[PDB]
Amino acid sequence: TCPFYKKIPGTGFTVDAFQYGVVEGCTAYFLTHFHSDHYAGLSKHFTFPVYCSEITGNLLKNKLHVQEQYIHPLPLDTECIVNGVKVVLLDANHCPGAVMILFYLPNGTVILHTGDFRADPSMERSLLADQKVHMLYLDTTYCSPEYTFPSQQEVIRFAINTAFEAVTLNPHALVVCGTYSIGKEKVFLAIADVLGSKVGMSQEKYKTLQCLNIPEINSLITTDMCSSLVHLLPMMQINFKGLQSHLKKCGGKYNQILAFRPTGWTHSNKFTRIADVIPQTKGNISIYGIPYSEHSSYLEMKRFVQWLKPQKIIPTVNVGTWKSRSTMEKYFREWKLEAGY
């Protein structure tokens, strides 16, 4: 059955709760963003109201084939009424169309659900600053002090300079960027822009990108692989074997590959700065691991929560084991004692 952390008290609302069949009591199903763990169970066969951003709605319609009558897109940063309750959707700084939701309960309680997010100081001057938040449903993906990473901008700058140098040294090199879902689009779009190229990709991936309300998208992406010097491939193909194979497929138009695997955290975050990063190399193919994160680091999460000062925290990630929950509760108490709430 639907866990308590996906229910919003004093409403018949749920969030990211599509895998449990019909939820008893539920009159409106919110979807924070289009990642398969969160949407799991939604399909053309779902017949209840789904509330979401416009971008998430485009994806639901076109990729999952959910019928249009059941999709209720809402604009950002706007007070809206859903089934008699005031809500606001905010940018989560995660992947395209990802939202946090603010719920104003009839009794006067205020609840923030972060969905998946990457906490940032610009969220300190949104509609959140205007009133007290009593309860916080928190993306606790990286809630442990070992999880540090550079800013998105440091990582993009590194990627840009690396790619520009390699292709100026060898104008017959191909750049490849690995991908599995939506998110991290800036990696491949910034590389292409410094090289004066469009990004080439499969038909399914192109269809996905065409839903995302990215300005000038038609000038940036194509399905003609031939005509482009940055290609997207599935993450699973980003290895020496898959990359040599792809290079045979392109018809001797390129004689070298430089490939980027955007990952989350891995253990080498604990020593190496972004400037020290060096690739793995086998012959005429080089692979760079770059920690481009769309989740809060420990320090970013801590700052956001210390600012917000919620009366209660409800974790939404890593809640499946008692050890993880116990560990997280310890960090929440520390933050509360340091900050005086």
- Site residues for Ni ion per CB under 5 A: 35, 116
Q: Which is nearer to Ni ion, 115 or 310 (CB)?
A: 115
- DSSP state, residue 111: E
**Least CB distance to Ni ion at residue 161 (A):** 28
Long-range contacts of 316-325 (CB under 8 A, 24+ apart): 316/5, 316/6, 316/113, 316/114, 316/137, 316/138, 316/139, 316/140, 317/139, 317/140, 317/141, 317/143, 318/140, 318/141, 318/143, 319/3, 319/5, 319/140
How far is Cα 3 from Cα 315, in angstroms, rounded to an integer? 12
How far is Cα 71 from Cα 42, in angstroms, rounded to an integer? 12
Q: Which is nearer to Ni ion, 35 or 303 (CB)?
A: 35
Q: Which is nearer to Ni ion, 17 or 285 (CB)?
A: 17
**Least CB distance to Ni ion at residue 329 (A):** 23
**Least CB distance to Ni ion at residue 156 (A):** 20
**Least CB distance to Ni ion at residue 35 (A):** 4
How far is Cα 6 from Cα 28, in angstroms, rounded to an integer? 12
Both tokens assigned to 275: 């400037």
Q: Are 73 and 54 in contact, with CB atoms under 8 Å apart?
A: yes
CB atoms within 10 A of CB 322: 8
**Least CB distance to Ni ion at residue 138 (A):** 14
Q: Which is nearer to Ni ion, 36 or 268 (CB)?
A: 36
Q: How far is CA 281 from CA 15, 145, 206, 261, 262, in A?
A: 44, 32, 29, 14, 17
**Least CB distance to Ni ion at residue 96 (A):** 11
**Least CB distance to Ni ion at residue 149 (A):** 16
Q: Which is nearer to Ni ion, 39 or 254 (CB)?
A: 39
Closest by alpha carbon to 21, among 36, 43, 51, 53? 43
Q: Which is nearer to Ni ion, 288 or 292 (CB)?
A: 292
Q: Which is nearer to Ni ion, 35 or 231 (CB)?
A: 35
Both tokens assigned to 333: 């108490």
Beta bridge partners of 232: 177
